[PDB]
Amino acid sequence: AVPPSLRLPVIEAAFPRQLHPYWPKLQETTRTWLLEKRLMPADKVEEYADGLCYTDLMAGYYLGAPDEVLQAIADYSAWQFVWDDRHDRDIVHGRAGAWRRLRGLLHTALDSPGDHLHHEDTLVAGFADSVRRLYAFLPATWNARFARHFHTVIEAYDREFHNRTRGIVPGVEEYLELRRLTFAHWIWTDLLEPSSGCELPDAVRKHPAYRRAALLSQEFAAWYNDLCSLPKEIAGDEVHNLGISLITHHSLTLEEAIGEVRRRVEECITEFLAVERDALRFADELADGTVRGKELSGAVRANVGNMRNWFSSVYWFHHESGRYMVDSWDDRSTPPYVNN
């Protein structure tokens, strides 16, 4: 029973959910990892980890992934949720020095994860373990591209720190550009390739149909998170949300901003349906009779299928996850799963 303001009949009808067969083992292995890496207090892992649905999100997205690949992705994605919470708490508590240090340590650990596996900051050590694991699947050129993308993500989070401490709400286009980075669009897109077992050549992954399909998948997911997480974010003085930027800079009411964000999300869906046809036709064109053409064809088809799966996984995640259930909290500004 999705709230009417969030319900998207086209997702529910035309994007049937998928679940990776490794999901039951993934759930418990990631929860054990969060425990053993001390990424969340033991009592909060026990009360909340499963209800957060982080592994469910990844297992509905990277279909076809080798189990070991999906495990590293899920650990890394759970880490990224804990990092979002740490960033939030550093801003709320004014810990600009602790944030600047963490920011520098994540840049360094991203380039040399092996050196940071036992770092005193458990958030850095957990980061390093998952990244080292992700670096073991594909050639070093893929690792370099992952790192280049995530160094950009870290700096976008630094920009968020400064906006929120100065109480600056970005403008709408400013925000849309920043959101492609704080949502980690290009990391999810990069992770498609170890999930289908193939580093794609630049010529294939920069093909306009592949690029546009990948963009729209992520714009849908980021803006649907904005639509669904707007209440928790207003309650916690978050400023980064397309709806907040519309209410703040365009005098829209809550109702009007929500309607506009919905319309933008819906347009992502139908633009995706159009370019999906071209991206799958390109996957067909890559199968040229050769072994290599078959490899690339199958990899592009799997990645475009997972671009599609991201729509339904993100849609349902926001209605199942404890992360967004702000009406259940005694303190609406402090989620119970965050370390305060």
Ligand X SMILES: CC[N+](CC)(CC)Cc1ccccc1
178 binds, among ligand X, Mg ion, none (CB under 5 to 8 A by kind): none
In 3D space, the residue among 189, 194, 219 whose CA is nearest the CA of residue 207 turns out to be 189
Which DSSP string corresponds to 102-157? Answer: HHHHHHHHHH-GGGGTT-SSHHHHHHHHHHHHHTTSS-HHHHHHHHHHHHHHHHHH
Of residues 84 and 266, the one with the C-beta less far from Mg ion: 84
**Cβ at position 183, least distance to ligand X in Å:** 5
Of residues 37 and 207, the one with the C-beta less far from ligand X: 37
φ and ψ at residue 325, rounded to 5 degrees: -85, 60
**Cβ at position 78, least distance to Mg ion in Å:** 14
80 binds, among ligand X, Mg ion, none (CB under 5 to 8 A by kind): ligand X
Largest CA distance in the chain: 62
Task: List the one residue from 218, 229, 248, 309 that touches Mg ion (CB under 5 A).
Answer: 229
Of residues 225 and 321, the one with the C-beta less far from Mg ion: 225
The residue sitting closest to ligand X, measured at its beta carbon, is: 84
- Give yes or no for residue 225 binding Mg ion (CB under 5 A): yes
Query: Distance between CA 215 and CA 139 in Å, rounded?
Result: 24
Neighbour tally for 273: CB within 10 Å: 14
Q: Which residues bind ligand X (CB under 6 A)?
A: 80-81, 83-84, 183-184, 221, 225, 314, 317
**Cβ at position 44, least distance to ligand X in Å:** 16
Using CB under 5 A, count the residues that bind Mg ion.
3
84 is in an annotated binding site: yes
260 is in an annotated binding site: no
- What SS3 state is found at 57? helix
**Cβ at position 281, least distance to Mg ion in Å:** 34
Of residues 282 and 317, the one with the C-beta less far from ligand X: 317
Of residues 76 and 135, the one with the C-beta less far from ligand X: 76
Query: Distance between CA 27 and CA 295 in Å, rounded?
Result: 31
Query: Distance between CA 46 and CA 262 in Å, rounded?
Result: 35
Query: Distance between CA 150 and CA 142 in Å, rounded?
Result: 12
Tokens 């092996």 -> residue: 114
Task: List the one residue from 6, 23, 35, 84 that touches Mg ion (CB under 5 A).
Answer: 84
175 binds, among ligand X, Mg ion, none (CB under 5 to 8 A by kind): none
| Numbered residues of the known binding site | 84, 88, 225, 229, 233
Contacts to Mg ion by CB under 5 A: 84, 225, 229
